TrEMBL record, chains A, B:
PANTHER family: DELTA-1-PYRROLINE-5-CARBOXYLATE DEHYDROGENASE 1, ISOFORM A-RELATED, DELTA-1-PYRROLINE-5-CARBOXYLATE DEHYDROGENASE 2, ISOFORM A-RELATED. This is L-glutamate gamma-semialdehyde dehydrogenase. It comes from Thermus thermophilus. The lineage of its organism: Bacteria, Thermotogati, Deinococcota, Deinococci, Thermales. It catalyses: L-glutamate 5-semialdehyde + NAD(+) + H2O = L-glutamate + NADH + 2 H(+). Residues 46-512 form the Aldehyde dehydrogenase domain. It comes from the Bacteria. One of its GO terms (biological process) is L-proline catabolic process to L-glutamate. PROSITE patterns: ALDEHYDE_DEHYDR_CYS, ALDEHYDE_DEHYDR_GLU. One of its GO terms (cellular component) is cytoplasmic side of plasma membrane. Keywords: NAD, Oxidoreductase. Pathway: Amino-acid degradation; L-proline degradation into L-glutamate; L-glutamate from L-proline: step 2/2.
């Protein structure tokens, strides 16, 4: 099967009147459908429950954006039975056939781009460009994994020949597994975590994050329209731990793909290491568990370029990203000039309802608001608050861009992941000290350096211990194919999304010899 | 660096007078050197202890082959410090430099080959050809991994370009880890499990199996002469679980490479899943945990050819192989002709001191004798003893080749790994039933089919769920490079040894973008 070489889906900037009109049409369509109820999707059919879950607009939380069915253990067991039944034949599809199905799903998703973007705007508080980036990344995962799976097709393995025998090694998929998806990229990461395993012949039960169940259901409408056979993909919105715990601990769950907090990721990895009664394999658990990502700037940098990249990295999607710059490490020569520029830029950021395309929407929920404001209270005790640090007026969960300065490297706000619009600025003497401070966290996801000094950049290339490092640009928005995405240390298992190596995680290898 | 394409090291059959002359001298010299003492090897030096461990000759256990120092937690901690210190610089060696070091080690091992084979004969009771296959396999791991490692060299990752930027993804080693090696291939598997991680820039602390400490020490004389820098490889023989437990559970152990019993493998995997106090990463654990491997024969097979392969597979090295045929699954039309031929061949097998080059030597220890004899007693209930089932006369741990017939598929002897010369014969109707019985164990390591029917062979290729499958040939003796070795289910994590994929398990990936 031959398609165009992979290109990333263009992220809409909405600079043309047509693009803006198309977005306004989509927003209107989406809000007109706020009354909709979305069931579970199990074994090729939409399956409703008596209990329901409600999704709220975090920019106006008295407004409901939709409701969904709510799965429990029994629905979890039913999806597991459907997923294994499906696996029996889905594993046997030619890779070309599986990859074409993915390419169909991508095309369907591309045609519904604005609708999904508008759903992100209303359901999770993404501004328009954050929304467009999220949907473009989802399309990219589908496009990329569809192609990358072909690189593993029967029989892919390079082996040494032997006289008088055929020796053939090849990959096969693992089985049925569970995906536990985050709310912050509930199209992109939700989609990538499902379609990667699915591309190469696995089957998946997906649990969306509670805050993003409506957009996950809309992704499943796309899967259903594309024609995935019954049981290949399954959708189980649920409240709290019930569904996730039941499946993670199940003797018949083959693998777990998780993106979310370190707290939950640790529990998952530990549970995966245990043999449940009657289990007959060693579970694979892939976890991406957040970061405490720093940007270093030294005295040689373009200070204006740095301040722009820092503000984008710190406050894009309200800093609710595993890749967000939450630390700003400035050498002595860079300290005042860069801090001054960041403050002047950050003070001009708009905050408001996401549908108006502000620089910042609200944080995602009342619980998130609580967590972020709690950390602000801690930061006031630990460093010097110099911008923001408060809730803004409106029912929506609006928090001001916040900056603490003179923060000790080992302070709680310089160590713990806040996941909100809070930047901690750490002053150091020189680049050596900057690198020490950068590395001295439990995390290792993203990181950045602004500097013109080649020796410093190349030193960072070798020694700034993060899985995704960026020089003289923002540290967020890793593109599928371009920047394999995944971290070190307590940022997770280094399962690199948007890379050829990702699909290998969902395969095992068989070696078959025939002596003639 | 450019070397000849990989070829497997030829396995000596000792058919020429030249080869027998050389082997007789090597065995005489090793026998003459019984009682030698070998210290620990930590941080580039031999380090002795007050306590010592004794390695006996299983063919004559009143004879001490040699003694070694005995490591405790203190020595384990010293080796860990030495390994991390070494890693700081070993990680930065050009890959060509690391690979040349491995090629030197291989050359030295090749030059000491008859001595190493003789040491196996005496220390673990391998006959001459089993000893030569084992040493040849070790040389192959070194040669193979030295070349495979170059395929990962900076910057190896295929990425999609982006305008105005360099995007560079590359692999880095993980750090210091522990190798826990088996007694049954204590040159081959010991060597491969250590040099694989080491080749790509990791550092290793290696715990040999207690029954094979002397030959492990001679491998370390080779590492030393080759000139691995201090701390890069460390040798810690020890008694019972203290050393392995201390390292497996240590917050500063990065990875665990284990080959051995399922019982121990399960505990290791569970422990690796936990975050020890102060730990700052998710541990990787690679485990290969044995098999209950079957050969199926249908009525279309060459019955003479099948009987030969079955007897080699079941009784080679006294059946003490994770790859050994311990089940013989025969369709109704194959049953009588194949069993007759197996019995006639098996009854002709010699059993005696390994130095004599018998068909079978002793089992490895008093504990193994006890375990295998205990399983024979179990089998006498569950099946019908038709051959052997007894300890033979002598101080050595001699056990007769044993056959049980009419064994129920779910019998303990048809499900549990005995790791001795004990074959369970299972009657089935046809090839479909043969596959069902083959698959219905907790394991999935090796398997074989003797059949001339193309449709049966290709059906098995798809459905006989083992990681190493062989048609019309023995199911043991997987060759490095030719047959990537590793299983499914409770045979372990499918870390395929002797394959390009193995080295990827000891690396993580960094993605570094520069915007110009
Ligand atoms: O790097 C980022 O910001 C997004 C989130 C996961 C990967 N792409
Ligand atoms: O297949 C075999 O018999 C040995 C065991 C480990 C791989 N080579
Ligand atoms: Na919501
Ligand atoms: Na011994």
């Amino acid at each position: 099967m031959t398609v165009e070489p992979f290109r990333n889906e263009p992220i809409e900037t909405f600079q043309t009147e047509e693009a803006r009109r198309a977005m306004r049409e989509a927003l209107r369509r989406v809000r007109e459908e706020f009354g909709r109820h979305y069931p579970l999707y199990i074994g090729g059919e939409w399956v409703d429950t008596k209990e329901r879950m409600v999704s709220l607009n975090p920019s106006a939380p008295s407004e409901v954006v939709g409701t969904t069915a709510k799965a429990g253990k029994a629905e979890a067991e039913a999806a597991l039975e459907a997923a294994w039944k499906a696996f029996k034949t889905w594993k046997d599809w030619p890779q070309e056939d599986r990859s074409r199905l993915l390419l169909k799903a991508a095309a369907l998703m591309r045609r519904r781009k604005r609708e999904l973007e508008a759903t992100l705007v209303y359901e999770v508080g993404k501004n328009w460009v954050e929304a467009s980036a999220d949907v473009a990344e989802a399309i990219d995962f589908i496009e990329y994994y569809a192609r990358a799976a072909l690189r593993y097709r029967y029989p892919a393995v390079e082996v040494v020949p032997y006289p008088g025998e055929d020796n053939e090694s090849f990959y096969v998929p693992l089985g049925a597994g569970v995906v536990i998806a985050p709310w912050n990229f509930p199209v992109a990461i939700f989609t990538g975590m499902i379609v990667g395993p699915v591309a190469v012949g696995n089957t998946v039960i997906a649990k969306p994050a509670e805050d993003a169940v409506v957009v996950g259901a809309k992704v499943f409408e796309i899967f259903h329209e594309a024609g995935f056979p019954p049981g290949v993909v399954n959708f189980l919105p649920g409240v709290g731990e019930e569904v996730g715990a039941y499946l993670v601990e199940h003797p018949r769950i083959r693998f777990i793909n998780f993106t979310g907090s370190l707290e939950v990721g640790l529990k998952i990895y530990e549970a995966a290491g245990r043999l449940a009664p009657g289990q007959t394999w060693f579970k694979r658990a892939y976890v991406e568990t957040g970061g405490k990502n720093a940007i270093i700037v030294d005295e040689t940098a373009d200070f204006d370029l740095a301040a722009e990249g820092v503000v984008v990295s710190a406050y894009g999607f309200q800093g609710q990203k595993c890749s967000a710059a939450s630390r700003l490490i400035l050498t002595q020569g860079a300290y005042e000039p860069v801090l001054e520029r960041v403050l002047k830029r950050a003070e001009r950021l708009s905050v408001g309802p996401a549908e108006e395309n502000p620089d910042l929407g609200p944080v995602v929920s009342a619980e998130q608001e609580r967590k972020v404001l709690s950390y602000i209270e801690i930061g006031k005790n630990e460093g010097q608050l110099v911008l923001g640090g408060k809730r803004l007026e409106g029912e929506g969960y609006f928090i001001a861009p916040t900056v603490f300065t003179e923060v000790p490297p080992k302070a709680r706000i310089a160590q713990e992941e806040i996941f909100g619009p809070v930047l901690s600025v750490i002053r150091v003497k020189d680049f050596a000290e900057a690198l020490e401070v950068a590395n001295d966290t439990p995390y290792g996801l993203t990181g950045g350096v602004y500097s013109r000094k080649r020796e410093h950049l190349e030193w960072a290339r070798r020694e700034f211990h993060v899985g995704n490092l960026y020089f003289n640009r923002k540290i967020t928005g890793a593109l599928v194919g371009v920047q394999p995405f995944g971290g070190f240390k307590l940022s997770g298992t280094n399962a690199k999304t948007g890379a050829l190596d990702y699909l290998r995680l969902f395969l095992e290898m068989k070696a078959v010899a025939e002596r003639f």
